[PDB]
Structure formats: structure tokens, C-alpha cells
Scaffold this active site. Sequence first.
Site, PDB file in Angstrom:
ATOM      1  N   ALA A  62       2.796  -6.215   4.960  1.00  0.00           N
ATOM      2  CA  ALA A  62       1.800  -6.595   3.933  1.00  0.00           C
ATOM      3  C   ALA A  62       0.574  -5.693   4.079  1.00  0.00           C
ATOM      4  O   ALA A  62       0.309  -5.227   5.214  1.00  0.00           O
ATOM      5  CB  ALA A  62       1.442  -8.049   4.083  1.00  0.00           C
ATOM      6  N   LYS A 108       1.402  -8.549  -3.953  1.00  0.00           N
ATOM      7  CA  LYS A 108       0.753  -9.510  -3.006  1.00  0.00           C
ATOM      8  C   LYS A 108      -0.655  -9.859  -3.508  1.00  0.00           C
ATOM      9  O   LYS A 108      -1.533  -8.968  -3.491  1.00  0.00           O
ATOM     10  CB  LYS A 108       0.613  -8.918  -1.600  1.00  0.00           C
ATOM     11  CG  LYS A 108      -0.255  -9.733  -0.651  1.00  0.00           C
ATOM     12  CD  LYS A 108      -0.475  -9.104   0.726  1.00  0.00           C
ATOM     13  CE  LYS A 108      -1.340  -9.970   1.617  1.00  0.00           C
ATOM     14  NZ  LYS A 108      -1.840  -9.257   2.817  1.00  0.00           N
ATOM     15  N   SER A 150      -3.682  -6.405   8.575  1.00  0.00           N
ATOM     16  CA  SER A 150      -4.716  -5.399   8.895  1.00  0.00           C
ATOM     17  C   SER A 150      -4.057  -4.161   9.514  1.00  0.00           C
ATOM     18  O   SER A 150      -4.712  -3.112   9.505  1.00  0.00           O
ATOM     19  CB  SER A 150      -5.836  -6.010   9.721  1.00  0.00           C
ATOM     20  OG  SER A 150      -5.351  -6.748  10.821  1.00  0.00           O
ATOM     21  N   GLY A 151      -2.778  -4.249   9.916  1.00  0.00           N
ATOM     22  CA  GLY A 151      -2.003  -3.151  10.544  1.00  0.00           C
ATOM     23  C   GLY A 151      -2.192  -1.794   9.859  1.00  0.00           C
ATOM     24  O   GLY A 151      -2.609  -0.833  10.534  1.00  0.00           O
ATOM     25  N   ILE A 152      -1.881  -1.701   8.566  1.00  0.00           N
ATOM     26  CA  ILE A 152      -1.951  -0.437   7.774  1.00  0.00           C
ATOM     27  C   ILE A 152      -3.414  -0.092   7.490  1.00  0.00           C
ATOM     28  O   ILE A 152      -3.753   1.098   7.577  1.00  0.00           O
ATOM     29  CB  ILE A 152      -1.136  -0.554   6.470  1.00  0.00           C
ATOM     30  CG1 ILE A 152       0.362  -0.714   6.755  1.00  0.00           C
ATOM     31  CG2 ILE A 152      -1.429   0.609   5.534  1.00  0.00           C
ATOM     32  CD1 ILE A 152       1.039   0.506   7.325  1.00  0.00           C
TER      33      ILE A 152
END
Lengths: 515, 524
Positions: free
Chosen positions: A42, A71, A352-354
Site C-alpha cells: 500500500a 486505495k 509508510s514503506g514506499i
Amino acid sequence: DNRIKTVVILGGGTAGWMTAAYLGKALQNTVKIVVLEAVGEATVPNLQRAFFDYLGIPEEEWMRECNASYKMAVKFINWRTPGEGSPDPRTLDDGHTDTFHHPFGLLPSADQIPLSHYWAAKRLQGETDENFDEACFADTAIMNAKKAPRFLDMRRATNYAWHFDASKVAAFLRNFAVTKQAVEHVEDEMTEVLTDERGFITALRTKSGRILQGDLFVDCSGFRGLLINKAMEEPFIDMSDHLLCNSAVATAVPHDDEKNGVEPYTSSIAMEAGWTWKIPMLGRFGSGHVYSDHFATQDEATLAFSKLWGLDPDNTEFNHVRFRVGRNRRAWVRNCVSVGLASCFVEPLESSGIYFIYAAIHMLAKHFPDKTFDKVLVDRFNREIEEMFDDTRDFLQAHYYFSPRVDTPFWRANKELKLADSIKDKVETYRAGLPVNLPVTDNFEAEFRNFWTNGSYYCIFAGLGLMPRNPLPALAYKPQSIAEAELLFADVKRKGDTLVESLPSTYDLLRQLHG
Amino acid sequence: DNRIKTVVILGGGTAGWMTAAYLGKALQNTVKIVVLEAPTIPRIGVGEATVPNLQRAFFDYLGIPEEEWMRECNASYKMAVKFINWRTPGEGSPDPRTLDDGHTDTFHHPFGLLPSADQIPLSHYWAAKRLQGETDENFDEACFADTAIMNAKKAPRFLDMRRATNYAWHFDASKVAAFLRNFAVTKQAVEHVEDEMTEVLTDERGFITALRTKSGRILQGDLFVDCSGFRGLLINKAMEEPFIDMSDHLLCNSAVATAVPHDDEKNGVEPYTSSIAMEAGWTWKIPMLGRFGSGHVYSDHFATQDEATLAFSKLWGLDPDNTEFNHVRFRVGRNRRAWVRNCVSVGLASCFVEPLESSGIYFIYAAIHMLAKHFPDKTFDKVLVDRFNREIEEMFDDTRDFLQAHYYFSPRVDTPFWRANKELKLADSIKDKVETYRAGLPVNLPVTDEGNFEAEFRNFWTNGSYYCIFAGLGLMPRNPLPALAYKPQSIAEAELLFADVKRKGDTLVESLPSTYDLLRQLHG
Ligand SMILES: N[C@H](Cc1c[nH]c2ccccc12)C(=O)N[C@@H](CO)C(=O)O
């Protein structure tokens, strides 16, 4: 010519190829860029503004090539009620269903006061029984009715972000970077990091016995941190003293999109000893049970995870990930810049990864050095990475610590952890009925500084049932403003009903886009 | 009903009547508002400069249109503060000296926006060119069209009142006070009580219950706003709240002012405030129609009241014993806390700095705005009060540190004053920002492309305002932004921006009315 002549990126995947493509465009072919490379994801909405738009790749092009779905929020199932995990939402002490949304829609204001504050007043004074999400965001109605955030003619309805296959985005970008942007891809293991007298990296040695000479080195090597941690001896700061989860177990689940339709949102399904993401794509949804290995064994976690979806434990393929929670003492040391998992990581609870990858990349291009590696340039970069990370860490803590759940060693242990001062101060603020980081929008500098704002705090606090002690006192003097706010609550209901009517379904828009 | 029922504002002037009018509108006649203003011995109109959010944040909230309040206070236009002779040594003069490198010692701090190429502000391209000898333009003239227009004394609007640049305002403080009083009394129910305060009556907890007047009348209250000036009669005396002196950051503590009749047909009217550097301080020049207000800000540790008055009169060719002067001693700093118990300080009673970047009024509607947002009921939630206090100290310290940089990075060392400035410690905030600037990085990028008051107040001094001052004084980055060495296309895009600026300035220096001509139309 004191300039960097060659950037060597170690590791591929999203992190390495996002770095290669961005630096490709940013540095305008004045620098040779080399990559050395041997569940669902996401995102948040600046991904197009701050990355794909810089690369000049239109949204439809990259979406079509990585099986991308829409999303509109992260939706939080059973974060308040106790018991074993289920995709069906339990029913609360006060009767209602344990679901709350964190959408990307904006809050309108009356008399320079956000709608969040009018709703709190009404709720606290028993003059409404609406939850915050439903009352304040049209988006919520649309997500309940599984509708798309654009019409078929592709006019925009709400703000939105993206679900996709990490590895497919990597593939699309690699290809972009190699063909359209001069990046040299080298398929080979790294076996040695050659370092000069000063502890600077001079080159990476490959298994084939070749050396890759460099000037600046980007570590996109994952949690292993092969340059930033091992070679450069930079300590990593463990922050399981703030977030307990440290493990996950994932899989793709084939999904009947004609029967059910496709959810235009990520789902955080609460669990025994952690939580489980659900990331709808076309034909399948990615899912993973994030957990703490101190509160559940790998098997306990896998059985619970399979149980949730009605999967056969010995008839289903699982990826098992141990992950670091925290960040390097410094992201950038000498001529080694870390990006993605090698820099820092948190459970993908608010996706928040990307964001962390293109945040880091963007800050690297801005603080891009010459060979003197000005201490200040490197420091200012390091400072932006720690502020960014600590912010998102503290937001995530709030998700756990203000869960009412105390029915599992895990859920109780969360409340035994120290709140960081930043989030303690913000809660104290919220409780007085004041807003928390009012948003600065009616450029990416603005988005990144002020990233979690008033609406995102109400979404989570309200959603978990933490409320102000009392309404914002100023509201007791602004009867005209209260009135103006009702017309806004009405405008929301109308907007949601007109769109739940006129909008295509998610499923119908995906079908058009992928054909 | 736990609400505040009555707000008592002590003192009038800008501070008291801005508070009365704003709270009048903000609280929507759910609260009785009383002002207690001493009888006013008329001073001379020494002029007040503002920043541009004054209309957005204040007059537009009150729904008073710009022309109405302008016509009633003899208001002129302000496109910048212009800094004359801040680099060269010697006696004050309105004429700018010439630097060793053959430029004239003037630099502008305008309100215009900086365009960006490749997400990098124009300031940074200009620094690259300047450092690499590829231009001899100063920052102000290269980057802001406004600069060309100010050199050519032109108005910021056409006669048809289409907007040309961003701008702010010069006016007579006392006349704005008068206009607002009248607004607040007639259109907003405010009770005006002309009388001295003699007694501050307090409950068991030290909360103010009422003020007694000299006539023996007693003014019951729930919330008290101290707009009583430097004397701080509620916040400092009655409430015993200590004031934090900050002459360890800014040395000036005195001024001497007057209005100067001015031949607007002969000379034209400057659409800007002028900070004219001086022996032991500086002198403002605030053009209005027919006259300009001026005051020599000075430190009484480096020049006597006389020395200062002689120098000031000398500057404008005024007869020292044939001219009317206001003499002001002022405190520089702020209360330990702005808001104690149910006493909120606003204006001089809260905090003050020399009007070098025209922050006097900004401080007032910043405070007022924050008061309406943090407005309490009678339980006076201590968090509500604290959050307010926090906003006022951050706001103040920021503008304090900005002003320090004006002095500290002056090359002047030709007077005990100018040298003493260099002996003061830089605050860490401004030290860190200079270190940033010196590496070639930007300093607080603005959050506006080309908004709501949150945006204006948080991010108040931004990259452009830092380049304006640092560059203007000749503090420059140690080297260009290194990223620029890799972005030849970006450099190119930036030249088209420098060109667009030259074009804008030449088209407008032609087509725009003069300041003088627009004032004459406006003041029918
Ligand atoms: N702070 C400015 C606007 C502004 C607000 N109050 C001021 C009072 C004096 C001067 C300027 C201003 C801004 O946001 N951006 C510009 C700086 O000139 C930039 O592009 O950096």
C-alpha cells in the site's frame, strides 16, 4: 571538476530501482548509475506527485504494468473489541461495529476551525451518534459502497493512493531505468566492499571477480545493511521499545472480484498477537499477519493467519519475514547513503514503506554532494531522515497504546511501553479539544514536513474512542459557526449519496484500466 | 453556562482596539467587551509599517474593505523595507554610500514570491552565478521584479486597481486606532470607558475579578486583556509576571521621531519603508501622502538622547530647537509568559522589538488570532493557556533572531555600537540557519506555491527573506548548491526565469502609475 562521476547502488527491488530511476532523471546523465542486484504494498497519495511525475511516467502507464488497484484509506477492523482475528467486524460495548477509516480526503473548515472539532462538540454533548469517519468524510460512504475514486471518463472524484505488487513495480522501473535512462544493471553477488584509508568505499567486488569503482554508494541491500551497517560499522538503533511487532507471515489469496467486488482500501485486521493487512489487487489480495515473536511463535502466527482466511496451513505458500524496527544512528556515513530497509523500517500499518524510499531519494537529490562530502550537507540529510522516521514511528505507537484491548499479553504489553514526548504532547493537546498539526494546504516540502495532520489524528484517536475531555471552548461563543458547520455536514451527506449513485464501482474501473 | 461573560481590555491604541474589534467579531455578541483607555494627549504621527497579511488576517475578518480603512488613516503602499548604508561606515545620510566593489549600499527585502526551477528556488541559481562571476546583479534586483518598480517609485496597483505585485501598508497608528474604536463602539456594541485604572482587584487565587477607575467606578470581568503598553500594568505589576530582557540579542532601547512635511509632486512617494543606518542605530522612513514619518532607533549605552536628536535632525536638515520630537524608551524582550491566570498580554505589554522588519502590528493580530483560537471558558484549562504561551514565545524568538542577523552580519565595525553587535552571542536557531545557508542549502523553504493563517504564522521568515538579508549584507554561501553542478537543463530553465523577471520589471516600470498618482486617486 570535483563532481561525483559514478553512483553505485547495491541491491534492486523497489528501493534500488526507485533510486536508479530518480537519480537518472535528477542528475541529467552527468553521472554513471550502476545497480548490483542478485505480499502486496500500500502507498500514500504523493507517490504520483513526488516520484512518477518527476520521471514523467503517467499514472495509467505504471498502473497497467504492475496490476495496480486504488486505495482511499486504511480501514481498521476489530482494534477495540477482544478475541481471535476475523475479517468480520465484532460489535462494541456501545453496540456499533468495530470499523474506523483513515482516508486521504480533506476536512472542510467553518470560521477557520476544522469540521473534526464541530463533530467532537456534537458527539461529546450527545447531540449526534455518528462516528467521526462517516460524519466528516464523503470518502467513507464511497468505500462502504466499494466505489472507485474516478468516473469511467477518468474525472477525479476524491483524493486516492495505490495498492500494487512490489516486485512488478521494481521490474517496470528497472526496465525504465536501463532502456530510457542509461543505468547499467549488473546481475552478480557482491562479495567484498573495498574501502580506502579514510573508511570511504572505493569499489564493490562481484563474485565473477570484477570490481565496480564508485564515488557515492547507495545501500539498498535490505535489513542486512551490507554497506551502511557491516562495511561502514554504523550502529542501528533498535526501537522495539516503541513498537513490539518484529515478524510477519504473508501470501497472495486468489479472489472472486465478479462475486464480491474490489475494496478501494487497505484493511488492518486486528489479531491475537499483532494485525493482518489486506491489499486488494485485480484477481487477488495480498495479506500478511504482522506479529511480535516475543508474544507468539512462528507457528501460532501462521495457524491464526490461515484460520483468518480459511486457508489450509500445509496447502498454502507463506513468506516468513523477521524485520528490524528502528533506523541507523545516521542514514548517510562518509560516501554511503542508505535507502529503504537498510535505512529504517516500521510495520506497514499506515503504509509508510514506499513513502520512506522516495522521501529519502528526494532528500538525496536535494543534498546531492560533490567529492568533498561537506559535513553539513550529509548532516542536514541525516536530520531529515530521523525527523521523518521518528514522526511516523510516534504515529504508529498511538495506534497501539490507545487501543482499549487488554485481552492478550501483546495488547497489554503495548501500554507498558513509554510514549515518546512528541506523541504525549500531541495527546495532551488533543484532550484540551485543540487541533493537532493543522494542515498547511487550503510542492513536496509542504507534504513531507507536516505529514501527519489534524484529520489523521482525529481518524485514529476518535476511531479507537479516545476523545477530547471537552469541546473546543471557542465553539461555545460561535453560534453562527456551529450553523455554517451543519450545512457542511449536509454537503458531506449529499456529496456521498450523489457519488455512491453516479460513480462506477472499483471493479468496473480496474476492468477498463487493465483492458 | 461556564462561559466568559465579560472581557475587559485595559488600554487603547492599535493594540486595544484591534483586540476589541477582532474579539467583537470572533465571539459573535456572546461576550460583553469593555475598553478602559486613559485620556489621550495627541502625539505627532511618526508612522507605522506593516507586513501583507494585515488585510487577509484582520480587516477581511472584520469585513472592512481595504479602501475604507486606507482613506480614513492617510495610508500609503509598502513593497519592501530598503536598507541604506548598512555595509559602509560613517554619519547617517538618506543618500546611499558606494561600496569598495562599486555597488551602491542599498538592498531590498520585498514581499514578492521567488519562482523555482527543478524544485530549487531562484535564490540558489543567482548565488551560483554570483559566486562564479557569471553575473554582477545583486540578489534583490535579479530575483524580484518588485525591485525595478521600487527603483522607479511606481505603485503596486494600476489606476483601475488591478494588482501588479504583492504589497503591505504605511499608516498613522493613532488614526487606525481612531477608525477601529469608532468601528468597535458603533458597529460592535463595545463599551468605551475614558478614565485611568487605579486598582486591580484579585480573588484568593490571584485571578483578576475587576478593575477600579479613578472616578471610583468598578469594571467587573472574567478575562482581562493587558494592552497597557511597556508599563504592563496587569501582566507585570499586578500579576507579578517577570519580563525577560533581551538586550543580550538586540542593543537598541530608545528612539526619537517626528513627521516631516514632504513635496510629493517634486520627489514622488517611495512605495517602501527605508531603514537608513546611523551612528549608533538606524532611522525608519515611512512615506504617507504629504509627509513621511521618521524615527532614529538607537542604544542609549552608545549615544545620549542629545547626540541621537542632533544626528536625526542633521539627516533630514531639521532645526533641532525648531522641530517637534517624540522620545520613546522601550523594553526589548517578552514576558516569561504572555498569558497568566486570566490576564492575556497583547502588544507592548506582551513583547517588543525595534520596528526593523515591521513586526509591531503582526505581533498584535498574531496574539489576538491565537487568543480567539485558544479562547477559554471560566475553568481556564491550563493546557489552553500553555499552548497560547508557547505560540507567542516561538513567534517572538524567531523574529528576534531574524533581527539579530540584520546587525551581526553587518560588515560595519566603525563605531562602538556596530562593533558591540558582533560581541553579542548568536542564538543557536540563527547559528544553525547560517551554517545551513553557508553550505548553499535553502533556509525554511516556503509552503506556498504562489493560504490559511496557519501557513503564514508558522513559516513566517522563509528562504527568500534570509537571502534578502544575508545576501544584501554580503554574507554568501561558501559555495553553490552542489546539486546545481549536475543539472545543466535546470540552470537553463532558471535563465528563462531571470529573463521573465527582467521583462516583468520593464513592462511594469512602463505601464504602472506612480505611487504618488495612485495615492492622489485613492484620497480623492
Ligand atoms: N515569508 C514570505 C511571505 C511573507 C509573509 N510575511 C513577510 C514579511 C516580510 C517578507 C516576506 C513575508 C514567503 O513565504 N516566501 C518568499 C520570501 O520573500 C520565498 O519565496 O522564500
